[PDB]
Design a protein around this ligand. Structure first.
Ligand code: SF4
Ligand code: F3S
Length: 106
């Protein structure tokens, strides 16, 4: 599985879904996650994310390890997203801001 980490939050560019061959992205109000059972680890989305939020599970930074389970959990309850949309309005402002997990919306 690949995993969406902190920097997506309040950015949510949704560039990543456009290259996903298996459509395993699931949508929250201000964040996307990858369904780990669905992901085929093609790695195609990693270079697509402007926020550079996506990692191979085995390359998730130690300080963002919580994101792994969080992706798996939210992927069970959020709706599939398979089409790019406008990035969130103040995305440029939040890109690069750390600890955005405190802003995650269910
Ligand atoms: S690694 Fe491939 S299959 Fe998994 S989320 Fe990214 S694009 Fe989709
Ligand atoms: S900001 Fe999030 S919505 Fe996709 S293109 Fe990056 S993981």
């Amino acid at each position: 599985a690949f995993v969406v980490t902190d920097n997506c939050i309040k950015c949510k560019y949704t560039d990543c879904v456009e290259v996903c061959p298996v459509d395993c992205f699931y949508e929250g109000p201000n964040f996307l996650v990858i369904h780990p059972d669905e992901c085929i680890d093609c790695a195609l989305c990693e270079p697509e994310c402007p926020a550079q939020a996506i990692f191979s599970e085995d390359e998730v930074p130690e300080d963002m390890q919580e994101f792994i389970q969080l992706n798996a959990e939210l992927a069970e309850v959020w709706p599939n997203i398979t089409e790019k949309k406008d990035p969130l309005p103040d995305a440029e402002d939040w890109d690069g801001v750390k600890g955005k997990l405190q802003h995650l919306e269910r």
